[PDB]
Design a protein around this ligand. Sequence first.
Ligand SMILES: C[C@H](O)CNC(=O)Nc1ccccc1
Ligand SMILES: C[C@H](O)CNC(=O)Nc1ccccc1
Ligand SMILES: [Zn+2]
Ligand SMILES: [Zn+2]
Ligand SMILES: [Zn+2]
Ligand SMILES: [Zn+2]
Lengths: 197, 197
Amino acid sequence: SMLERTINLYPLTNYTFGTKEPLYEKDSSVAARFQRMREEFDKIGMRRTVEGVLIVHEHRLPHVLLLQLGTTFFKLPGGELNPGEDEVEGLKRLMTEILGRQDGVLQDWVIDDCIGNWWRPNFEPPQYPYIPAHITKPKEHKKLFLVQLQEKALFAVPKNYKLVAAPLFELYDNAPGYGPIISSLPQLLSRFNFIYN
Amino acid sequence: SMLERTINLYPLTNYTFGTKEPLYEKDSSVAARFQRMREEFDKIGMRRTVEGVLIVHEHRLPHVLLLQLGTTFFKLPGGELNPGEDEVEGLKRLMTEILGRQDGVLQDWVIDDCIGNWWRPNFEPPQYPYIPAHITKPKEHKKLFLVQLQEKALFAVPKNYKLVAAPLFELYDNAPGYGPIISSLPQLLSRFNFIYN
Ligand SMILES: C[C@H](O)CNC(=O)Nc1ccccc1
Ligand SMILES: C[C@H](O)CNC(=O)Nc1ccccc1
Ligand SMILES: [Zn+2]
Ligand SMILES: [Zn+2]
Ligand SMILES: [Zn+2]
Ligand SMILES: [Zn+2]
């Protein structure tokens, strides 16, 4: 009766947050976002996205690292796989492009746990933790992974974003503030045995 | 990049649901429930509860088995551990007392996965997927486990309950209908690779 995965957490003060050039969005609006999703679905099929959950603590209270675009939406680090790209190699690539260092030193990403799956049935905002009834051609499939951090690290944050550490209580039942994926992180993280180092 | 746990599901028509004598609640009201929780906290400390998630399919659509008390609340099979009782042996004991057969043949319970943890800070209904800030003496700790079923089985259901198979879409965003633990099962089950046998 020890069936929980054990995960090491380190203090937020163990991590250094530097800066680098802006990293711009591929779409300038919601309307362009859904147009490009339609164009690529017709050429290569369902969009495959991957996202990483990176956890720290302060004073033994766990916090998720989020990327805030100016003072607008909160995002997990991640993005779109290429056709035939492995999911885990692809999340490591995407996290190096977002938070990798100006001095070109390699981060050691450790990814060993899936923490969920979401499906977008139409070219519209709604997403579900299952394929809904009657839907045979979903337009996007997102996969979330727990990213185990090293004891210490330097991350370079694009100048147009803020890295923020959110406590779980702030996420919980806050879909209006964070949306349905980030707001359900407390439930999805409850199964881990965290060590507060 | 295959990090998901694989789980076999079988058709609901593979399972037989017989009947047996009523199984009565330990508390006759909400008021007696919170009185007994107070009395036992003073004698043996925090309540330790365990619950099982039992999954089937029909026509390749997953469903969770719930126990309905008359036409009132929906419950997971489970209940209260004794002082010093192992969590996994204790859930197997409790599920045999609820759904074990009138003819006294042994069910083969397989329990290999934790799917979450909830904490009750006071002698009151609110529960969280974390220990809230400032709380040092939580009054209850619930642990949920995924119960892998065999290809076929007979379950005896107490005459005062109905066994019902709920599709995930019915649970999703339905805390008013099911409460915060059962309503978040779709998110907590999204990480599994189900095989529809
Ligand atoms: C929310 C998206 O669908 C997937 N995640 C991302 O695109 N994440 C991201 C991208 C650029 C900078 C910072 C973060
Ligand atoms: C909801 C409770 O705190 C824990 N679970 C149960 O007590 N489950 C249960 C008990 C008796 C019959 C049927 C189901
Ligand atoms: Zn401290
Ligand atoms: Zn898919
Ligand atoms: Zn069928
Ligand atoms: Zn506890």
